[PDB]
Amino acid sequence: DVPVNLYRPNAPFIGKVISNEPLVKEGGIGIVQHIKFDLTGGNLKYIEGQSIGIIPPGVDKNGKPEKLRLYAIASTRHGDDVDDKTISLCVRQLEYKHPESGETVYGVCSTYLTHIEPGSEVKITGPVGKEMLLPDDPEANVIMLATGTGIAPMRTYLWRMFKDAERAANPEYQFKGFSWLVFGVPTTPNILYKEELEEIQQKYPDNFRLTYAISREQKNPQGGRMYIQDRVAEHADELWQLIKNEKTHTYICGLRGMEEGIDAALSAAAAKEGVTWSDYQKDLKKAGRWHVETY
Numbered sequence: 001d002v003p004v005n006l007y008r009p010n011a012p013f014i015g016k017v018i019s020n021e022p023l024v025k026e027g028g029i030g031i032v033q034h035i036k037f038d039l040t041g042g043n044l045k046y047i048e049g050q051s052i053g054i055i056p057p058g059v060d061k062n063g064k065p066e067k068l069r070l071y072a073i074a075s076t077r078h079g080d081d082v083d084d085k086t087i088s089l090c091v092r093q094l095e096y097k098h099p100e101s102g103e104t105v106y107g108v109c110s111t112y113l114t115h116i117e118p119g120s121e122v123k124i125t126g127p128v129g130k131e132m133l134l135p136d137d138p139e140a141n142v143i144m145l146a147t148g149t150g151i152a153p154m155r156t157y158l159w160r161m162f163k164d165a166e167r168a169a170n171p172e173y174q175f176k177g178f179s180w181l182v183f184g185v186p187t188t189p190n191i192l193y194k195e196e197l198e199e200i201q202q203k204y205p206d207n208f209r210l211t212y213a214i215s216r217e218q219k220n221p222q223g224g225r226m227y228i229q230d231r232v233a234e235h236a237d238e239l240w241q242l243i244k245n246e247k248t249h250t251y252i253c254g255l256r257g258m259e260e261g262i263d264a265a266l267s268a269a270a271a272k273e274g275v276t277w278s279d280y281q282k283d284l285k286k287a288g289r290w291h292v293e294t295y
């Protein structure tokens with residue numbers, strides 16, 4: 001029974017910030033924060049792959065109240081402390097330029113979130129989303145293709161699969177399939193949750209594969225900067241082979257633009273066996289096994 005819209009924007013849950021910690025290490029590009037919120041005093045429950053809304057304070061340029069922005073939940077259903085009391089987000093401060101009006105422009109909700117102080121009250125809505133749900137089958141294979149904050153739902157899956165405290169809390173979900181995260185960020189300091197992702201791979205080398213595309217540190221075979229599409233091309237046959245399994249699910253998450261390259265790579269692999277990827281993919285989407293969340 002998937003929880004949905006336990007809180008709506010006309011009457012959101014007022015949560016309290018517990019912590020706000022930086023995920024981008026020194027020498028990284030930009031600001032991405034792990035923000036944990038207290039859910040006690042309300043009934044907001046959620047599952048892995050879902051999102052919540054945050055309503056920032058203030059009015060827009062037209063004097064109208066700011067509307068919610070959606071953020072993929074970055075914590076498992078139990079929260080980071082496995083106490084069912086919290087929810088966490090993985091929020092990048094949006095910044096861009098020109099041509100324009102002024103200089104650097106800062107996104108309203110993301111700046112609010114990335115600078116929020118512990119103790120602050122936050123308007124939270126949701127949860128929402130049924131497109132990024134993890135299968136209950138402990139034998140499923142799970143391919144995770146993420147860039148930047150697209151890591152968020154992947155963390156919910158991986159923590160539930162691989163954290164000691166999660167395994168203890170979830171007797172009915174003892175993961176024994178194969179998971180493969182291909183994660184594209186510009187620098188090593190930008191590898192969000194690097195230490196924990198690497199701890200998982202070290203502990204579960206037969207159940208979790210971790211592949212990085214680090215654009216400022218790595219070049220693809222054509223001499224271009226390395227992106228997630230390049231790693232998918234590099235492993236296209238293996239990925240296609242995994243995708244052919246009736247129990248394999250694929251998840252794609254992050255800023256828009258990565259899908260075309262991923263499709264081209266898998267299209268070339270499937271074509272070798274006389275399969276039209278775009279058609280096979282349509283069928284996968286219909287079966288709930290091809291999960292995309294780009295923004």
Ligand SMILES: Cc1cc2nc3c(=O)[nH]c(=O)nc-3n(C[C@H](O)[C@H](O)[C@H](O)COP(=O)(O)OP(=O)(O)OC[C@H]3O[C@@H](n4cnc5c(N)ncnc54)[C@H](O)[C@@H]3O)c2cc1C
Pocket residue numbers: 051069070071072073090091092093094095096097106107108109110111149150152293294295
């Ligand atoms: C399902 C879903 C899940 C999401 N999950 C996350 C997440 O986990 N983490 C996260 O950080 N974000 C996530 N987002 C994006 C998030 O919802 C916000 O859109 C983002 O944080 C920016 O909102 P803001 O209020 O800071 O910017 P706003 O003040 O709302 O400004 C956004 C506007 O800025 C302009 N703009 C944006 N980018 C550029 C650009 N590069 N160049 C020129 N103009 C630009 C556009 O006009 C855009 O409408 C998710 C979005 C969706 C839909």
